[PDB]
Structures are given as structure tokens and as C-alpha cells.
Amino acid sequence: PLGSSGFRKMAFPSGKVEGCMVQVTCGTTTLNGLWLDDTVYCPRHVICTAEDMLNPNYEDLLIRKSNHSFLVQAGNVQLRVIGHSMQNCLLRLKVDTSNPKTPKYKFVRIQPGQTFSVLACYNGSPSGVYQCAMRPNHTIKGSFLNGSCGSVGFNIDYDCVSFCYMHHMELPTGVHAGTDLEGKFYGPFVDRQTAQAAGTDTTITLNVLAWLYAAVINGDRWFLNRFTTTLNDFNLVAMKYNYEPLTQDHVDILGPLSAQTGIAVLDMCAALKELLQNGMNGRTILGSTILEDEFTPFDVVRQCSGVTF
Amino acid sequence: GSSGFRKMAFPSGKVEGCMVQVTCGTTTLNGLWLDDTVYCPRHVICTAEDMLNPNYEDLLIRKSNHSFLVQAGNVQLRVIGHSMQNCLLRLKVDTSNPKTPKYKFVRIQPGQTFSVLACYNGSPSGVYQCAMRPNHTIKGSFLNGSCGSVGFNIDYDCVSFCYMHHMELPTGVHAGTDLEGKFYGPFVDRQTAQAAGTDTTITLNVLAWLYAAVINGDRWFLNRFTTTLNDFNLVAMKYNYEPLTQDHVDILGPLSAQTGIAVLDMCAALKELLQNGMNGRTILGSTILEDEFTPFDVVRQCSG
Ligand SMILES: */C(=C\C(=O)OCC)[C@H](C[C@@H]1CCNC1=O)NC(=O)[C@H](CC(C)C)NC(=O)[C@@H](NC(=O)[C@H](C)NC(=O)c1cc(C)on1)C(C)C
């Protein structure tokens, strides 16, 4: 139906979020802010200077700031800050103007394995959009340059924009860490430039299974077989390839796709099982040579059914 | 430090504000509303009996302005004029689109990349980045109901529209036109057996991608060898790779200067990768050589 091409890593239309991006400057430190109604949300380290990043005392640094300390700009117009407060690792700046482009929205905390669209921004101006998955080790493999902090991650659930991520930093392994819109970090990371490392990461088995279902839905079904497996037996095999242990909850999440295809989850696991033990023998799935793990069951239904927003 | 590397598309907001629904007879597809004009695939005027050998000249003359129903959300836009330009229809409406961004129509070259905003019934579904294949086809992800969807690039505040979706080839790839209605490739808008020319891997892009990996801190695939442009091509063509020209190398100049790796030396590395494979290793997380990133996309994502 979609073509013989292969699954495209599609991001949600970003228009509604672009309408919320602004630039926030505190002294010489400039980054991005999220403007919703009369509040601008941004990383608290915006109040930090060059040497204030090793181990900043945010509480004491903020005390020395007044509403006039923050320069907020939407396009070429200044947005007057009339109040400020810190919430975990975010700053909440009250402005005298409610964003006319505020979309229906909500803040949600994403869970490991789930995906979202990232709108990379610089100087309050959206530069690009791509799909990311919250890795099992609580980091995301994004693409960010200096000045990108404040950029946000989101999903669109029907007619509502669900914000789930705000960018704060990069780890030595070249991966990224951030918080939800309540300023709470995903993972054990802290917003300071100290020695911090992401734990060992694993392949999101739930997503790989969802991707195989997408392949079947698209007509790529050569890898399917006549057998089934137990969760226990599948996990013994999968964990050799550093795959996340599959749980009964993951099985259930795959329910809609299992129904659409009539293929029981454990039956698909048996297929995945053989793929890991015998490889693809040169063949491809959805035009791919490897097993994609950044497409959730929801992303599959979204792309295969043509859901609009 | 490393920036990371993703196949990112341009933000789609400026294009989302231009999408509308266009209906004629019982066929509904997407249209692009700019100022007081709506652009859409001319096959919207076809009936199930006109799919094989349609004469659009003859089909269109039998239409009037009221034969077209244009809708922006739940509001009807009155068509006050219509005309065909190559494979597109240009419908003049009685009201201007206030969301029209600064824009221009460009016909891109094979190998260049662009963002696609997949739409259905005039509503946005998703956005993704892709490359115009050397054979002019697009390896996209489209379901029926998606014609009228457009491809584009954004430079600052200006949207350069370069593609509008029209069809899918037997092989599963897609074909379309520029915003002047001229098809990319030897294709026509009718349901006849049509085949795309042989495709090739976009060599310039693979090289740009290797440079991306290097600026990002990965250098495992490099070697102490070098090669001539001619010797590289003799090997590359064996793997169905586009021949590399002196123009392509000059284009890689900036990336070459920034990394300290001579273009011909990078070609020597690519030469080794093609002949010996990746031995189970990965580059920028990929196990295959990626060709959907132009040299411009790399400098843009890796260095503003
Ligand atoms: C956003 C800041 C911004 O936009 O500021 C505008 C003035 C960045 C994003 C960063 C840019 C490069 N890619 C990105 O994603 N954040 C940022 O710079 C943070 C700010 C602090 C206050 C949280 N700093 C970092 O991300 C920093 N990371 C670290 O220091 C990290 C915790 N540790 C190590 O790198 C480390 C190495 C070793 C051997 O031990 N620890 C990087 C270096 C900038």
C-alpha cells in the first residue's frame, strides 16, 4: 500500500509546535523557549555563564535575577517577562501576552522505548524535525548543536499536542539527555557539566516486533514461520543479541497489530527468533537490511493507516 | 563534541498552512493554496473510465469553475477561474491565503534532497526527508488519497516547492512533477505500464555522509590509500554507483577542508568499503552506506 520503498521514519507535522518556539536570553546566554498561553518554559541553565556550568547553585543564581534579567523574543518582537519561578530543571517565565498560537496541549512523561518528534531549534527558530525514541538507558540519539537547548519533543494525540521532552545536554558518548515539561530529567542525569555516563543500552524489542508487523502489513512476509515460542525461550535467545527482555505487557501493547494481521505475538517472536539466529541471508525487510527499533506499535498504525492531524 | 546525526526534514508548518482539499466528480485529493491560487494534480478530473488513455484537454474543456470544490477545513473556497499547466491545474479562488509564506517554485536535480508533507483530504499526516533518486523516482511512503502532497526545502523564511505527488510505479516507487506541472522522469499521468530507468547510488551523498561520520568523531573506515578520479569510478560503477565528476569533488571542498581529509583519499576509503564491506561495523549507526544526505545537508546539520 505505502510502496515497496520501506518504512519512512515519519515525524508529526510540526506546525503547531513551531508556533510555540521563542528565544530566551539571560545576559549573554541565549537558548530556546516554549511559549504556551502566558508562560515561557526553558532550561534553567539559561541563567548560567561560561564557568557556572560545572556545578551551578541554581537557587542562588536565580536570586540574583529579576524579571528584567530575561529577554524573550518571538520573531522580532520582545515579550515582556512579568514573573519567574523555577520548577525542577526548568524556568517558568510569566509573560504579559498569551501566545495566540497556543494549541490544545498537555504535558506527558514518556516511557522507555516510546518515540516522539523532535523540533530542533536555534535562536528561537525551528531548524529541522526528526523522529527519536527514548532509549532503554533513558537517553535519546538526537542531532543537536550548541544553542539547541530548549528544543522540544512531542507527539500529537488526535487534536492535542503532547509535549514530552525538552533538551538540556549531551553525554560523552554523543547521545542526549533532557527532561519532561515538569523539569524532571529522564534517567539519572543532572544538569551540570560533571562526569556523567549513559548506561549500556539495549535494542527495543517491542519496537522491532512492531516493525515486523508493519512489514507484514506492507506485504513483506517471507520471514514468517509455522512455529511459536514461549516468552522465556524467546528472551533467552534475544538477550544474547542484547535485546530488551520482552514482557507480557509488551505482548499486550502489540495486541492491535496482532489483531490486524492475525499473527499472535509469540508467533512473531518465533519469526524474530529465527531472524536473530540465522540472519536475513541477504534478503531485506521493508527495504532494510537491519531490524529497526525506533518505530512503536503506534507509529506503525499511524503510517500504515494514514492518520491525519 | 559530536552533534549526532538524523535524517531530518524541514519544519512543515509553513506548508501545512497551505494544504487544502480539492474535489471534482467523486475524486478528492490535496491542493496547495498560495495567495489566490490552488495547485493540484490534473488527474482529479478523471473518472474511472478515463484512467487509461485520458485526454486532459478534452476532459477539462467539459468542466466549469463550479465543477471544482475546494475546501480549507470546513470552509468552501469559491473557484473563480481554472487553467491547466502541464500536469497540474491552477484554480483561482475568491479569497487569498493569509498563511502563504514567502515561496518560489524550483525544479530540483536528481540526488538533491527535500522534505515531503504527506497529506490526506487536505490534512497533514506526517513529514519526512528523502532524496530525488538518480532515475527521478522517489522512494516515498504514500497511500491512495495522497496526491497533491508536496515536497519542499526551506531556506530561512522562504519555502522552495519542488514536488507534487501524482503516482506510484509498478515497482512500488513514486513519481511526480515540479510546481509547473512537469514530471520528473519519463512518466505520464495515466494508468499504463511504465518503468523507471535503472537507478544508482548517489555517490556524492555517500561521500558527504562519510565526512559527516568523521566530523562526528568516527574514522575507522579511513585508510592510507588514495586513488585517481578515474580509478575510483572504475570500481564504483561496478557497484551501481553514480560516476563521480570533478564538479562533485569541488562540491566536497568545504567538508574536505574542515576535516583535513582529501576528497580523493575519502574516495579511497569508500573504494575499500565497497570492495570489503563493513565487516559487521556501523557508520553513524548505519550498517549500509547512506545516500540521502547531500554535502549541503551535512554542513547544515553538523555545523549550522
Ligand atoms: C544546550 C545549551 C545551550 O543551548 O546553551 C545556549 C547558550 C547544550 C546541548 C549540547 C550542545 C552540544 N550538543 C548538545 O546536545 N547543553 C549544554 O551545553 C549542557 C549545559 C549544562 C549546564 C547541563 N552541557 C553539556 O551538554 C555538556 N555535557 C557534559 O558536560 C556532560 C555531562 N559530561 C561530559 O561530557 C563528560 C566527559 C567526561 C570525560 O566526563 N563527563 C557538553 C560537553 C556541552
Ligand SMILES: */C(=C\C(=O)OCC)[C@H](C[C@@H]1CCNC1=O)NC(=O)[C@H](CC(C)C)NC(=O)[C@@H](NC(=O)[C@H](C)NC(=O)c1cc(C)on1)C(C)C
Ligand atoms: C494519488 C491520487 C489520490 O490521492 O486520489 C484519491 C482519490 C495516487 C497515489 C498512489 C496510490 C497508491 N500509491 C500512490 O502513490 N495516484 C494515482 O492513483 C495515479 C493516478 C493516475 C491517473 C496518474 N495512479 C497510479 O499511481 C497507479 N499507477 C499506475 O497505474 C502505473 C503507472 N502502472 C501500473 O502500475 C501498471 C500498469 C500495468 C499495465 O501494469 N502495472 C496506481 C497503481 C494506483
